[PDB]
Amino acid sequence: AVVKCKPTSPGRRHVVKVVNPELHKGKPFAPLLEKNSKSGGRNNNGRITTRHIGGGHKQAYRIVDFKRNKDGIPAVVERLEYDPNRSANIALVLYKDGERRYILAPKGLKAGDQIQSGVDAAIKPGNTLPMRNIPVGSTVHNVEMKPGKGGQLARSAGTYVQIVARDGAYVTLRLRSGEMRKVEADCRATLGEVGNAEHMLRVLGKAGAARWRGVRPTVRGTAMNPVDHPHGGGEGRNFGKHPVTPWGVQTKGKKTRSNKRTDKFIVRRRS
Amino acid sequence: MIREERLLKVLRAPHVSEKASTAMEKSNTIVLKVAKDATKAEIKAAVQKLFEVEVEVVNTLVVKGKVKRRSDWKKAYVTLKEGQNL
Amino acid sequence: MKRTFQPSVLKRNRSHGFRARMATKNGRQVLARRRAKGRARLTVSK
RNA sequence: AGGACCGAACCGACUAAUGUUGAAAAAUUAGCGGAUGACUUGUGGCUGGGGGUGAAAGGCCAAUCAAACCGGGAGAUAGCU
RNA sequence: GCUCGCCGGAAGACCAAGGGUUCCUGUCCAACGUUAAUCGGGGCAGGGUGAGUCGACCCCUAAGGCGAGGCCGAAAGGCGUAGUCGAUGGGAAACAGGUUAAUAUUCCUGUACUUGGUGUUACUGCGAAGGGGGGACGGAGAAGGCUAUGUUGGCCGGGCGACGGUUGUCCCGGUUUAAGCGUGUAGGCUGGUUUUCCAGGCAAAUCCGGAAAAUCAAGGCUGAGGCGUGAUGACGAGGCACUACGGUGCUGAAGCAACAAAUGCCCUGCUUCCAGGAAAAGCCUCUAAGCAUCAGGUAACAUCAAAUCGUACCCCAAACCGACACAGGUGGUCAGGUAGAGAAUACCAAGGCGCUUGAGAGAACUCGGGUGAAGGAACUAGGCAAAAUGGUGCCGUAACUUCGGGAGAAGGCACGCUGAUAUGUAGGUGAAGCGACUUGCUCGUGGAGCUGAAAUCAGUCGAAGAUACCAGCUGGCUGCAACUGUUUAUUAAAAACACAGCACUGUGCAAACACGAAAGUGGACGUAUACGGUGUGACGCCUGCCCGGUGCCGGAAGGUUAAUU
């Protein structure tokens, strides 16, 4: 449910929260947590390699099963949890043999539900199968790219993939970007869409709200001096040039994909 | 066992002062200059042997060298049990 | 006002101490230079 | 509840005077702003010079910055004084 | 020595950082000290820093550093695995009295506590680099139960007043007591115990996770404080001697209760929230290889060991950082009274000071104030500066609005003391007693005492009652930027920057993009509801036309076109 905050102060006037009553309110499952120290966007040279990163609330990483390997052991959903690390939110599942793991929570999934992975699991949300076994036209998420590697595709909040065709060892997938991609039919996938589809409806409302997601301010190119950015100075607001990145590559249209190793799998580039 | 030579090396001189005296006549403790690397144990054993007296405990402090050129030395507060030493 | 020198023995030794000089060949050349000149105090390490 | 409000500590620095061989190589005094936050501070660490870092001012990088400091090329060169 | 002033959430005390002997004592007065100096943080000489329990070292880890091999790179070197370091964090334990000229949780006195080793005795499954628990965690808010601490009574010791009064609803001081050990309560949390079994926790385990079944659910953990003991002890107002007039010794009365209490403790609790809140060791348990009448473990008891190093002094400052004994800067801890909402402020307490030139005069002029007749912005670039407003309760309050605001809008009025209501009320706290019981750190009832507003009415005073200090000036019309925020340290705080939002564009993951000859790394342990770049800048209403040019994107029929041959 998305809720507007009443405007008792600026900085609350425009906030729109996404409040979910079913998320576990306790601590997470400690055996599946690791420390995850922040970077500030620096690499091992100490230089900022990605700008506008830093600060933000401390977060502990939750180990999430993207592989979904325990085949044939049914698992019941214990609880759905907030995860600071994804836009999606996760579910603690207990396997009948006594093991617990985290998975991405599908759209309709809820506590008490039974999921299962394998080649013989039933076609219903939360079940993970090789895409040989999934009917064409299915809606899947958490799709693999190479068999046994782990899901990489359609893994954010409201995302999903449509299995458009099966031609031999490859299935054609309609990625959320609108791209047709071939992937080996032995790659696994999960039925359904990733839950928490309302995530995109939230409105941060204030600058501080962004600051505590670790996002630092963005200074526009045109507001700098010429030594700083190609959108240089000027007396007043002057632009007069084709827009570029801070490193002089034309933004606004110029195409940067240059990978011929995987071009064979791109049935149709997005639009 | 701490052998004979080290004991013969660890005791430099008896420290003589108002504090040292009053310590002797009140706490029945004697104050010594000792080798800067001497240990509670080494001082204890050396006093017991070379002075043939019985010791309760040793307290040590290193006196920092005064600007001039004074070297750092260790002062020892040796608490005898009941023997009168000197 | 706050001035530029805010001493810290730990930071001093980590930044200019003898073993910090010895860590890299450029520091060892600093040391070689200072011996060649005959510095009485070879580094900050006291 | 709140980048809520008023207001000490704390953190700033809008105005006026004084000081200008200063008590001070930017302070004092009287007011001033924020004061649960995009806060403030301690201790360590990390990023290095055409480089860093920058809520962007050519700001900042040891009272030094349209390119730090130190040593060398080097007694650069100077139709100029 | 006596007064007088000043600080008093500091200008007092205690540390860390840093410094380094400045510490304490005796001498000295050349230089130093903005003056003189007999004094000194000065000179010179002698002393002073005592630890199993405090800290460091040490065990363990974070950011990070380094890194056997390794992967790279003309060389130098870069990155990085096993590892190894690295606190600002987690791992065992002492408190009260007394002492020095200067050290004290260190010495001494009393009363303790911790961790190993070594024996001895009893009883026994012990044993990992492995497993599972634990450590071990956010922000806000709201209690309750407390304590430090204060205040008052009582008590005990003293007093009887330089001037009217003052054997008392008088005056003044004291009324302190710890770790430890015993006890287990206001809280807080979880049901428990067997039995069987297993697609988990590398393998495997009796531990943990799962699944059943039975029986009790009434069981356990945790936790301030209180209380007892420590303690017939210590301290203690004071006397009483002696005296170097510094001071020392000797003796020592009461030592309780009520109320009000923290920002401290219970509490790492609880409740809520979204932004979803270290790590590893100590620790505890399980086993594996092994060991097997052994070894180990466990308990008792004895013995021993706990090294080494720091300990002086300054520490919001004349000991640090500022060239200075410099009006500046400098993290943490403690914090009494009376007014007060307060750590504001006024005045004080403990404690510390009077700022290392003074003495006169009482010119202009300068600085920092006070007060002004009549006027009242006439000043000026401009109300700059000054003056003014100010508190609490209550009444009342406009346009406009995004319905929250505006709004302390604006504007009023009541504030003192005394007496009564009511010898102190409402309320809070609560003894005895009285019963109960699952009988004591109990519950109910009952109310002595203690504390204690706010009002109303009446009376009274001054010129004035938020009487000081303290503490909003207010309203109207517009520009710009939504806002809170950020910036030109040291002439610009803004209309600039940032911002939520919006759009465009790239980008299918070994992503784009960046930093790197590279290896790599960030992005991201993210996956198109995601990331990057760009323009704009909340919100409302909206964003027209033009593709000539110039970019970018798509096509390439044809012309042209490089090495090459």
Author numbering:
A (entry chain c): 2 to 272
B (entry chain t): 1 to 86
C (entry chain 6): 1 to 46
Question: Any passages from the paper?
Answer:
Co-translational folding is a fundamental process for the efficient biosynthesis of nascent polypeptides that emerge through the ribosome exit tunnel. To understand how this process is modulated by the shape and surface of the narrow tunnel, we have rationally engineered three exit tunnel protein loops (uL22, uL23 and uL24) of the 70S ribosome by CRISPR/Cas9 gene editing, and studied the co-translational folding of an immunoglobulin-like filamin domain (FLN5). In E.coli’s 70S ribosomal particle, the tunnel’s unique geometry is shaped by the 23S ribosomal RNA (rRNA) and the ribosomal proteins uL4, uL22, uL23, uL24 and uL29. Of these proteins, uL4, uL22, uL23 and uL24 all have extended loops (ranging from 10 to 25 residues in length) that protrude into the tunnel, and along with uL29, have surface-exposed globular regions that crown the perimeter of the exit tunnel.
Within the wider vestibule region, the uL23 and uL24 loops were shortened to lengths consistent with those present in eukaryotic ribosomes with 7 and 11-residue deletions made within the uL23 (23ΔL) and uL24 (24ΔL) loops, respectively. To further explore a molecular basis for the observed earlier folding mediated by the shortened uL23 and uL24 loops, we used 15N-labelled RNC (L = 37) samples to derive structures of 23ΔL24ΔL 70S ribosomes using single-particle cryo-EM. In silico sorting of the 680,941 particles yielded two major 3D classes comprising of empty 70S ribosomes, and programmed ribosomes harbouring a P-site tRNA-bound FLN5 NC. The 23ΔL24ΔL RNCs were resolved to an average resolution of 2.75 Å, where the truncated uL23 loop is observed at high-resolution (local resolution 3–4 Å at 3σ) relative to the uL24 (local resolution >4 Å, at 1.8σ), which is decidedly more dynamic. There were no other significant structural differences in these ribosomes relative to the WT 70S ribosome, suggesting that the loop modifications only altered the local environment surrounding the site of mutation. By contrast, the NC ensemble distribution is more symmetric in relation to the centre of the tunnel on 23ΔL24ΔL ribosomes where more contacts are made with H7 and H24 relative to WT RNCs. This combined cryo-EM and MD simulation analysis shows how the truncated loops provide additional space and freedom to the NC both inside and outside the tunnel.
